[PDB]
Amino acid sequence: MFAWWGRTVYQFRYIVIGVMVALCLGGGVYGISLGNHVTQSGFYDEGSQSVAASLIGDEVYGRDRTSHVVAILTPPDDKKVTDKAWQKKVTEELDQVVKDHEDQIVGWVGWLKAPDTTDPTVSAMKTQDLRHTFISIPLQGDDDDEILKNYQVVEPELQQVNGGDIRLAGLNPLASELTGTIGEDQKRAEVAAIPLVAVVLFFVFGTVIAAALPAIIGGLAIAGALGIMRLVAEFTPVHFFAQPVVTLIGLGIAIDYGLFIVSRFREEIAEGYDTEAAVRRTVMTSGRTVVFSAVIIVASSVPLLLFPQGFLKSITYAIIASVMLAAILSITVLAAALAILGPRVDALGVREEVERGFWGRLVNVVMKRPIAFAAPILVVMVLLIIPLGQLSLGGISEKYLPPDNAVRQSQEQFDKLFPGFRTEPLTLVMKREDGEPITDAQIADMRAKALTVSGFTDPDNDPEKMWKERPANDSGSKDPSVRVIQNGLENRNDAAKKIDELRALQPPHGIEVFVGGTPALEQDSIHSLFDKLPLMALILIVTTTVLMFLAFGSVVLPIKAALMSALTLGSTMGILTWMFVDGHGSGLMNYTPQPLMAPMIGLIIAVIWGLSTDYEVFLVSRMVEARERGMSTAEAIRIGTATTGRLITGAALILAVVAGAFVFSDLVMMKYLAFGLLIALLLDATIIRMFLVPAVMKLLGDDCWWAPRWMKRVQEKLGLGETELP
């Protein structure tokens, strides 16, 4: 197989170098148009019942724009707010803002337009102290992103009201700073880590071209990845955290892939055959190695397709495109580029034997007492997977930002004087058939059915006042064919129980019950994730194990690899749990202990499983190819793992630098992911490969291979069994 590829690839070097760059610069420049298009809202499971209830309710009554952006006004000099002067000034400023930006807002409404009101809806919104009062601004928008952009437009003067000492609250400021933190963090990463990423791999090489090549190809790969998944975005909206994660994954993985091939080609040109033969056997081995690692990681990541959450789909598409394009980038153009480079690789300039001796003696002292080198780490790793039991999960909120932040502080201050204007109630949608008003008793009978259960919010202290109709906006389409009511579950820890009891309620004659609302919206997501988790885990195990069995003929290695990766996964996620849901360190790292998001764990399990498995197979490719040189396993272990230690450690440190750069973020979730990758890589690099692979490898003796031939022949006739060089 791959001999044909080498024999045809040294033929075309200049042509390939031209065409690949000429066709990928299109995506490189096309990524800006991706930078234009952004979506933010999709986090909930699209196919559940709460989303359908919300959709039909939004159809019947429209959307309520009272909670988009909220400003807290405080008067200078501590003056009675009921005066005329300061109120006149603020109304002047606000109606000037209203007229100046017509399309963004509808206007302003609240207490401050009511001099002497009677109804305790806006007079009671004024604090008894009369030193803070909030007045809301509804925003005209077609959908979510249009509203967010309109609020971004109206930022300057709407924040520059009076002296500028009024604070802004609501969902829109939170979303705006959430999406601004992503850009700030991306700028910080691309300014800080990239120099370190380049110089670390430069020092281990002391070379110009050999150090520049991994970055040169990683940038092209990520540019193509954004181009491809933007082309996808025409058929499916892509979320905005797809911007930093594509960097976070692709940079490291593409640099790793290029680094392996560069190292092999250089170590083979320097010692063995000439340029062409060395590069063709270099592709012979490393091209299939990196291709197998890429197919393993895509097979491990595609199980995320099960979850219907949109941003998960976007992340999966971006990462699979990134890695499968980096694979073909590394195998195709790199071989020809190095072949035409020839002696120019290390000629640019600015230990070998001592380093190989240190590695060999470390391996031998592992062989001194391999079981004593594995039992303590085996015990401590389960000791580290213990703390996952106190795990708790929840949705996104305003506490996902550092407490020192201005918008978070303002939102927290909003509830200091306004107790119950920020409510998240549970909704009961109706299901009417005829389309004209059938009966007026249905609201009463559903009220009684809800009354069959106790433990709910009865602030009015009236048996009937509970469960009132939703405030219907005039712009909505009032179809008398579906009815919505609302009220709030008090303690959101009993939200699951209340939702279960309410969904179990009687659906009346011709009436079908629905349960919407933000608690149900954020609970159906976690329920769907926990229901689709088992098949996700089953495929993540089986597909990866079988696929990595096809790389090399042995069948024992997949078995050991499966539980070597799964236990590392458990250990790193347990360390993350003990660190975050308990906030151990927050005090110093400026975040808050809070439950993690539902989809983040589902993403992280798959991604770290893929990373651990691919790093392990990168290490063990030499381990398995060394034996069929006519040697036994005792020499093969050292032969495989001696020269590999120089390069994988540098690559691991590169990904560690990228993750550490992402650690300095503001959002808690990117901190979660970055620490997860740091801990998983640090474990699998420092301790796992260094005292666990040989520890079980020698203990398994020469039995390590024991490959049945009835499947070994199938392994052979795929053409990819060429693990021996002539």
Numbering used by the authors: 1 to 350, 382 to 757
What does the publication say?
The mycobacterial membrane protein large 3 (MmpL3) transporter is essential and required for shuttling the lipid trehalose monomycolate (TMM), a precursor of mycolic acid (MA)-containing trehalose dimycolate (TDM) and mycolyl arabinogalactan peptidoglycan (mAGP), in Mycobacterium species, including Mycobacterium tuberculosis and Mycobacterium smegmatis. A detailed analysis suggested that MmpL3 is a TMM flippase that is absolutely essential for transporting TMMs across the cell membrane. MmpL3 consists of 12 transmembrane helices (TMs 1 to 12) and 2 periplasmic subdomains (PDs 1 and 2). Our structural data are in line with MD simulations that indicate the major conformational change of the transporter is located at the periplasmic subdomain PD2, where this movement can easily be interpreted as a rigid body rotational motion of PD2 in relation to the PD1 subdomain.
To answer this question, we delipidated and purified MmpL3 in a solution containing 0.01% glycol-diosgenin (GDN) detergent. We then determined the cryo-EM structure of MmpL3 surrounded by GDN detergent micelles at a nominal resolution of 2.94 Å (MmpL3-GDN). The density modification program allowed us to improve the resolution of the cryo-EM map to 2.40 Å. The structures of MmpL3-GDN and MmpL3-ND largely resemble each other. However, there are conformational differences between the two. Superimposition of these 2 structures gives rise to an RMSD of 1.4 Å (for 710 Cα atoms), suggesting that these conformations are distinct from each other. The calculated volume of the periplasmic central cavity of GDN solubilized MmpL3 using CASTp 3.0 is 1,716 Å3, which is similar, albeit smaller, to that of the protein embedded in nanodiscs. A detailed inspection on these 2 structures suggests that there is a relative rotational motion involved between the periplasmic subdomains PD1 and PD2 of the MmpL3 membrane protein, where PD2 is found to rotate by 6° in relation to PD1 of MmpL3-GDN when compared with the structure of MmpL3-ND. However, the structures of MmpL3-GDN and MmpL3-TMM II represent the fully open channel conformations.
